[PDB]
Design an enzyme around this catalytic site. Sequence first.
Site, PDB file in Angstrom:
ATOM      1  N   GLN A 164       0.238  -1.269   0.312  1.00  0.00           N
ATOM      2  CA  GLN A 164      -0.231  -0.034   0.227  1.00  0.00           C
ATOM      3  C   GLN A 164       0.905   0.986   0.397  1.00  0.00           C
ATOM      4  OE1 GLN A 164      -3.200   0.005   3.039  1.00  0.00           O
ATOM      5  NE2 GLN A 164      -3.800   2.287   2.386  1.00  0.00           N
ATOM      6  N   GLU A 223      -5.129  -6.222  -2.612  1.00  0.00           N
ATOM      7  CA  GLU A 223      -6.182  -5.620  -1.879  1.00  0.00           C
ATOM      8  C   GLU A 223      -6.407  -4.643  -3.802  1.00  0.00           C
ATOM      9  OE1 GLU A 223      -3.837  -4.315  -0.269  1.00  0.00           O
ATOM     10  OE2 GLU A 223      -3.783  -5.230   1.539  1.00  0.00           O
ATOM     11  N   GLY A 253       1.837  -7.923   5.402  1.00  0.00           N
ATOM     12  CA  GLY A 253       2.710  -8.930   4.249  1.00  0.00           C
ATOM     13  C   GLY A 253       3.044  -8.641   2.900  1.00  0.00           C
ATOM     14  N   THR A 254       2.206  -8.079   2.263  1.00  0.00           N
ATOM     15  CA  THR A 254       2.472  -7.697   0.792  1.00  0.00           C
ATOM     16  C   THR A 254       3.398  -7.443   0.862  1.00  0.00           C
ATOM     17  OG1 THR A 254       0.048  -7.748   0.517  1.00  0.00           O
ATOM     18  CG2 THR A 254       1.745  -6.591  -0.908  1.00  0.00           C
ATOM     19  N   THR A 270       1.284   1.110  13.073  1.00  0.00           N
ATOM     20  CA  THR A 270      -0.566   0.669  12.926  1.00  0.00           C
ATOM     21  C   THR A 270      -0.622  -0.695  13.220  1.00  0.00           C
ATOM     22  OG1 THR A 270       0.689   0.819  10.323  1.00  0.00           O
ATOM     23  CG2 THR A 270      -0.304   2.548  11.575  1.00  0.00           C
ATOM     24  N   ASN A 310       8.055   6.401   9.925  1.00  0.00           N
ATOM     25  CA  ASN A 310       6.708   7.621   9.604  1.00  0.00           C
ATOM     26  C   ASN A 310       6.540   8.762  11.255  1.00  0.00           C
ATOM     27  OD1 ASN A 310       4.993   7.178   7.415  1.00  0.00           O
ATOM     28  ND2 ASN A 310       4.837   5.127   7.395  1.00  0.00           N
ATOM     29  N   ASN A 347       4.260  11.702   1.589  1.00  0.00           N
ATOM     30  CA  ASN A 347       4.443  11.119   0.018  1.00  0.00           C
ATOM     31  C   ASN A 347       4.905  12.491  -0.548  1.00  0.00           C
ATOM     32  OD1 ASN A 347       3.966   8.906   1.194  1.00  0.00           O
ATOM     33  ND2 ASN A 347       1.742   9.179   0.685  1.00  0.00           N
ATOM     34  N   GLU A 370      28.471   5.663 -10.023  1.00  0.00           N
ATOM     35  CA  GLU A 370      29.309   6.991  -9.572  1.00  0.00           C
ATOM     36  C   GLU A 370      29.171   6.927  -7.844  1.00  0.00           C
ATOM     37  OE1 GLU A 370      30.345  10.220 -11.627  1.00  0.00           O
ATOM     38  OE2 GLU A 370      29.283  10.057 -13.136  1.00  0.00           O
TER      39      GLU A 370
HETATM   40  N1  LIG Z   1       5.100   6.875   4.536  1.00  0.00           N
HETATM   41  C1  LIG Z   1       3.688   6.663   4.162  1.00  0.00           C
HETATM   42  N2  LIG Z   1       3.949   5.175   4.802  1.00  0.00           N
HETATM   43  C2  LIG Z   1       2.535   4.466   5.223  1.00  0.00           C
HETATM   44  C3  LIG Z   1       1.408   4.514   4.650  1.00  0.00           C
HETATM   45  N3  LIG Z   1       0.381   3.636   4.260  1.00  0.00           N
HETATM   46  C4  LIG Z   1       1.124   2.862   4.901  1.00  0.00           C
HETATM   47  N4  LIG Z   1       2.198   2.767   5.453  1.00  0.00           N
HETATM   48  C5  LIG Z   1       2.845   2.644   6.480  1.00  0.00           C
HETATM   49  O1  LIG Z   1       2.623   0.538   5.998  1.00  0.00           O
HETATM   50  C6  LIG Z   1       2.454   0.009   6.821  1.00  0.00           C
HETATM   51  C7  LIG Z   1       1.669  -1.347   6.323  1.00  0.00           C
HETATM   52  O2  LIG Z   1       2.436  -1.655   5.281  1.00  0.00           O
HETATM   53  P1  LIG Z   1       0.835  -2.183   4.271  1.00  0.00           P
HETATM   54  O3  LIG Z   1       1.625  -1.559   2.560  1.00  0.00           O
HETATM   55  O4  LIG Z   1      -0.289  -0.732   4.348  1.00  0.00           O
HETATM   56  O5  LIG Z   1       0.355  -3.335   4.266  1.00  0.00           O
HETATM   57  P2  LIG Z   1       0.330  -3.989   3.373  1.00  0.00           P
HETATM   58  O6  LIG Z   1       2.590  -4.666   2.934  1.00  0.00           O
HETATM   59  O7  LIG Z   1       0.435  -4.014   1.860  1.00  0.00           O
HETATM   60  O8  LIG Z   1       0.606  -6.047   3.481  1.00  0.00           O
HETATM   61  P3  LIG Z   1      -0.874  -6.387   3.434  1.00  0.00           P
HETATM   62  O9  LIG Z   1      -1.905  -5.175   4.227  1.00  0.00           O
HETATM   63  O10 LIG Z   1      -1.612  -7.612   4.625  1.00  0.00           O
HETATM   64  O11 LIG Z   1      -1.793  -5.915   2.626  1.00  0.00           O
HETATM   65  C8  LIG Z   1       1.718   0.260   8.241  1.00  0.00           C
HETATM   66  O12 LIG Z   1       3.515   0.714   8.963  1.00  0.00           O
HETATM   67  C9  LIG Z   1       1.969   2.018   7.404  1.00  0.00           C
HETATM   68  O13 LIG Z   1       2.276   2.842   8.897  1.00  0.00           O
HETATM   69  C10 LIG Z   1       1.451   6.144   3.486  1.00  0.00           C
HETATM   70  O14 LIG Z   1       0.934   6.511   3.004  1.00  0.00           O
HETATM   71  N5  LIG Z   1       3.150   6.834   3.498  1.00  0.00           N
HETATM   72 MG   LIG Z   2      -1.155  -4.321   3.326  1.00  0.00          MG
END
Ligand SMILES: Nc1nc2c(ncn2[C@@H]2O[C@H](COP(=O)(O)OP(=O)(O)OP(=O)(O)O)[C@@H](O)[C@H]2O)c(=O)[nH]1
Ligand SMILES: [Mg+2]
Lengths: 67, 428
Positions: free
Chosen positions: B11, B63, B136-137, B171, B198, B220, B246
């Site tokens: 995500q 997702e 996980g992802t 989170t 974060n 972001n 480099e």
């Molecule tokens: N800087 C920043 N961090 C994010 C953001 N969205 C989620 N995070 C962090 O990413 C971590 C979770 O990663 P995700 O990508 O949401 O979860 P995933 O890797 O897709 O795995 P699943 O939830 O099982 O699908 C959390 O600790 C969030 O704080 C964002 O928009 N910007």
């Molecule tokens: Mg996720």
Amino acid sequence: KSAFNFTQTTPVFMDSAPRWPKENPTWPKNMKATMGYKGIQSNYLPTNTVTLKAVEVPGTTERNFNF
Amino acid sequence: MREVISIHIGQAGIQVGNACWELYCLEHGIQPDGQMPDDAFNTFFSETGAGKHVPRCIFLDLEPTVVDEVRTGTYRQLFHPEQLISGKEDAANNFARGHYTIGKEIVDLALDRIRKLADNCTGLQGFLVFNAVGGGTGSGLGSLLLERLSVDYGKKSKLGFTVYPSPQVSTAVVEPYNSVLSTHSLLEHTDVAVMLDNEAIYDICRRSLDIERPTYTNLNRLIAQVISSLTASLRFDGALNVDITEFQTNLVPYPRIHFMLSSYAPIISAEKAYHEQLSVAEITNAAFEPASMMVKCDPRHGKYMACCLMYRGDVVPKDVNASVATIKTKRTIQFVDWCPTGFKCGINYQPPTVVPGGDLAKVQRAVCMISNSTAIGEIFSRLDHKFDLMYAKRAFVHWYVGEGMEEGEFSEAREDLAALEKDFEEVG
Ligand SMILES: Nc1nc2c(ncn2[C@@H]2O[C@H](COP(=O)(O)OP(=O)(O)OP(=O)(O)O)[C@@H](O)[C@H]2O)c(=O)[nH]1
Ligand SMILES: [Mg+2]
């Protein structure tokens, strides 16, 4: 040591007139040249001028080269 | 010819993909409908047979609930509909599912894209991995994907921009585990790995930006300002154009130590610019300031092995070499003895672009610093505590063992962290 007329035995009868590549009150001694050193060495470019310092703290290396 | 491949995983991977790709479309006058009213864009795009400038990136996730937003957002005429990869069921914050069960059934698809994404590529600089460790992802798919990239290309360079779990902000509860499992797979496979938390970027939005309701869309809009500054040399003229190879040679002393920090300056509200001049001198003092780090590490507890500075805008090298020189003398900043040097500097004449609706200010001088320090062991030992605090009870294990994993993968990925922290002490 004849045919040589050594300096230690040359009565004032014999005497030489000095010539140009030699200093003498008559002809002018034109300018000379010397090397002038880089400046005060530092960690940035060497400068000739001394400047103030904000962090004195005896025996420490802090400057502000950028101004 | 000077081109890179920008991957986004998870995500937060695609959450930053929406900030980065809103920048390059704006930094090159590329309308959201592909076309604009060379090599200024060839780093990120590919002119088709007529007019259209499609990007060269890949949005990967499990997702659909987010990748479809891109399909309905204003940037839907932009992407090739196959780049926006998505799945049916998600990893569910479980490293095993993202690695063993679900990861194995879409990588064969993603990889075909890369092959069809590299043939048009004539000279490939390196891959670009936007990853979020902790899910996980992010952790599972990312790990499984990187190994596939090593055995295909190997000689190409992978840069890892991985959001890391912060000390306070968390989170999730099981994010210690999958953050550990990621190391054994990223370390041997990424060429260099940047880190950022974060939490640290939250306080940056407090002191500097004075924005009291920060959100993921705000942060972001800062990361995109890093990569824009990082790859300015690839696409914009400038004194001391710095490529990737480099950049990578004089920053990574040993094949292990490739975990580095970041910074940015100036970060100010659009009104405090009226109270400052922001000279090249002033900015580079703020890049090395500990509060301007994008990670909750304290460089004053460690030593510097190298730094890299990418300046931008009205900057001339006579002032770079001056401001760097007055820093080696500063007592606070300690450089490890075996590098009396330590700075690769880069200049560009293209000032940082500003997006409408952003928080930063239009400036003519900006700095992005990326330092390899031995203080990075701090943030890496906290994980070694929470993992050893919860794993003492085998809590949440029955989820990982139920998805085609085992108990060895926990202790194995645990020693790799100890094997790493020694390396951050042998350099003493
Ligand atoms: N800087 C920043 N961090 C994010 C953001 N969205 C989620 N995070 C962090 O990413 C971590 C979770 O990663 P995700 O990508 O949401 O979860 P995933 O890797 O897709 O795995 P699943 O939830 O099982 O699908 C959390 O600790 C969030 O704080 C964002 O928009 N910007
Ligand atoms: Mg996720």
